[PDB]
Write a protein that binds this ligand. Structure first.
Ligand SMILES: *Cc1c(COP(=O)(O)O)cnc(C)c1O
Ligand SMILES: *Cc1c(COP(=O)(O)O)cnc(C)c1O
Lengths: 464, 464
């Protein structure tokens, strides 16, 4: 079709989007569709002749929607939030229209330059040390990665390469294969699975560092592991410290870990995928104290900062430390900052979001969510039948019906079968725990109260 | 903002998109902006209070656009085409509205199931062997990757893992570090750089296979390299065969390479990033004869098949051969098929495109482009002052002004400085060559004739 048709159709799509989001509260959050349901509802072959937009759009309602899990219903309380905001959407539309591939500066200077500048804005909102800012003459800078799992993998590969170079440039005969055999990487036992994948791909060993009572990685445990391993002939080289674990949203001790990785000369990567967004708020910024020591810091604006998915923010103090694994001031070659060669004009989304919401708007959004999270915690704290399993700092609450894991597995089964709200569990020291996460952009105190009541009702029934 | 505002603003954005594309022919293809131009035209900090959509949109025209390289101007004849169609755009808008993250089947069954089905449609359009189709009981299947460079890397990692396992299943007690040291991978000397990055990340050795007169990889050269290396104690394990090299769009011999990789038991990956789209046309399908032998096949619909960037299609005959590196019929866990854990509902784009254009529409688009490419070749063939450097099969023509490399470097400099059209050169056996690639969706015979005339004029001037 041509421009004229797109004005028509494109505008129809906008109303569709608005309708879907406007009425999302009337959607059943989790689907009843069975695995493999879709293939039989669709032809076996692409059509030879065109189909009608109208026809395709109703297929969306009648066939696709039944297999959709609505992350944006205020009743979606699973995992962590995924971002979705009108400003990013508008931006995404533009990005697609300009349709450039920023694999090189010449392919579109702006695709590259807006990114560096936006990463600096965000860097400043987080109050990161100047060492991470590109500016006009800093050895550091930031880049948009596809996801936190990729950011982590990129850091590990940069670390791996850096340690192999140092070792070979000090031991002539030395082969890389030799160095890999003894390379060890560490992460909290609460670390995300993206770390294992990273070690797996990078071809190195990964060890877990037992966490403390507050589920945090401490200097003590880390040091022990290091000594134990150096003494065994191994070579520590990478450590991922997590800020806002996926289990209970706890925080590794950065002021204790940073100094250790520094003195031991270990690449320290900080994965704050979820909690990172909160650091633009003074109240929480302390949680990030210690970045000073990090070689690379990452968090997902596509989780809790309203920038629609496909937007993870990563910073490093020495651009060449990163650039070297795939080979000041202005950056022109992002292709040495990530795994793939191509990339979209993703920074448009950050720009539209940061500009259309403003810093204050963003801070409010986060606080409202943390407020809602504490309201839920209160409910649980008020009912003697339940218990709150971990300190509640941000938008996640881990609760439990006082009793056995069997009793709790049961409550969960009854909650999901009821199809009103959607929750996910996790194990916290082997114990079965239920997670309550504030997600949707449009969640209100009302949704939480109703959600709690519904859970309390089911627990009661189950208890009789 | 809320749904109401988005209907307004969102519709404005649609007209903006339509205007930009509608008037793109009046845009200067390549920018005059200097590196680093943007930072000083934007504030140093994100705004505290909201900004106006109206204000943001004019900033787009006045500040972003001057730094944009217009890939969709019919006068953009660089690299290879990047896709952009209204159907994919409409689809992308929807994808963002639904906004789910398909990291697991439960996160949204449809995000996963539509993908498998679409990959089968495309698989059939290409007339791939049934072995690659998921169907209801095939060990194979296809997945959308972020790009051809990632597809290649994924294949190599799958290969690496598979050969390390076999070698230990043979000599129980064999270390991985040991096996990597001797692992060798091959690619044509015309292969894309994504292959080197892959070998670099995977930590193995990569060797180039000298190409023939038609710049193709032949059985002879490959076999020679293999023997030479096995005999030296090395272990061949991965071979990338390219269909549509970026230099002159030549084709490795798949009927010669497949059998070799089979008997030698080497993982054979086929990178047809650009040329692959043409295979939905019977006339060209022979170029793909030999996939039968491939372990993995890949091409970019986001290049020459109108599915907006962020859409590379990859197929394998044994899903577990792929799944194993990151650990029939219906597929539920795409997370073991790619590097990252998260993913967008990208298949919506393929669906909208395939349905709104229909197979015949797609075939016409490709043929029209190949027709235009041959029209250009004709022009060059008609002028005794120039020469065509390689067989012209698809949308690319490599030409040259008869003379020295210096003379040609000069023509190129004069073409880019003129700012009418945009071309890129490359070296073909050390010789400086100019590339002419049909890209934009809206290119016509008229654009090509004017482009040729303009180049002939500049060549003439220069020749005096
Ligand atoms: C959500 C999460 C991830 C995964 O992020 P993606 O961008 O989906 O890869 C990684 N680490 C932590 C701590 C997370 O909370
Ligand atoms: C364009 C191209 C690639 C790279 O594709 P992306 O998806 O941009 O990474 C790889 N191989 C060939 C032959 C190509 O033409």
């Amino acid at each position: 079709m041509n421009a004229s048709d797109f004005r028509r159709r494109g505008k129809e799509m906008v109303d569709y989007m608005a309708d879907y989001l406007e009425g999302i509260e009337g959607r059943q959050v989790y689907p009843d569709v069975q695995p493999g349901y879709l293939r039989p509802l669709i032809p076996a072959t692409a059509p030879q002749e065109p189909d009608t937009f109208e026809d395709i759009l109703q297929d969306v309602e009648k066939i696709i929607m039944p297999g959709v899990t609505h992350w944006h219903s205020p009743y979606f309380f699973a995992y962590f939030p995924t971002a979705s905001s009108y400003p990013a959407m508008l931006a995404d539309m533009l990005c697609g229209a300009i349709g450039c591939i920023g694999f090189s500066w010449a392919a579109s200077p702006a695709c590259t330059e807006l990114e560096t500048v936006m990463m600096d804005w965000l860097g400043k909102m987080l109050q990161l040390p100047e060492a991470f800012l590109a500016g006009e003459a800093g050895e550091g800078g930031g880049v948009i990665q596809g996801s936190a799992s990729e950011a982590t993998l990129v850091a590990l590969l940069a670390a791996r390469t850096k340690v192999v170079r140092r070792l070979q440039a000090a031991s002539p005969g030395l082969t890389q294969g030799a160095v890999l055999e003894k390379l060890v990487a560490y992460a909290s036992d609460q670390a995300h699975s993206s770390v294992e994948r990273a070690g797996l791909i990078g071809g190195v060993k990964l060890k877990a560092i037992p966490s403390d009572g507050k589920f945090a990685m401490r200097a003590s445990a880390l040091q022990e592991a290091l000594e134990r391993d150096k003494a065994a002939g191994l070579i520590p080289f990478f450590v991922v410290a997590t800020l806002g674990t996926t289990s209970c949203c706890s925080f590794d001790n950065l002021l204790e870990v940073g100094p250790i990785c520094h003195e031991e000369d270990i690449w320290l990567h900080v994965d704050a995928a979820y909690a990172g967004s909160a650091f633009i708020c003074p109240e929480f910024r302390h949680l990030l104290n210690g970045v000073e020591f990090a070689d690379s810091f990452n968090f997902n604006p596509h989780k809790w900062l309203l920038v629609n998915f496909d937007c993870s923010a990563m910073w490093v103090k020495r651009r060449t430390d990163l650039t070297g694994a795939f080979k000041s001031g202005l950056i022109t070659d992002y292709r040495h900052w990530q795994l793939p060669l191509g990339r979209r004009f993703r920074s448009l989304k950050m720009w539209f979001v940061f500009r259309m919401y403003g810093v204050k708007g963003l801070q409010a959004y986060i606080r409202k969510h943390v407020q809602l999270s504490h309201e839920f915690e209160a409910f649980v704290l008020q009912d003697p039948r339940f218990e709150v399993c971990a300190e509640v700092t941000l938008g996640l609450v881990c609760f439990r019906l006082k009793g056995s894991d069997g009793l709790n597995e049961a409550l969960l089964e009854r909650i999901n079968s009821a199809r009103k709200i959607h929750l996910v569990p996790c194990r916290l020291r082997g114990q079965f725990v239920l997670r309550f996460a504030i997600c949707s952009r449009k969640v209100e105190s009302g949704h939480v109260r109703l959600a709690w009541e519904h859970i309390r009702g089911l627990a009661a029934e189950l208890l009789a």
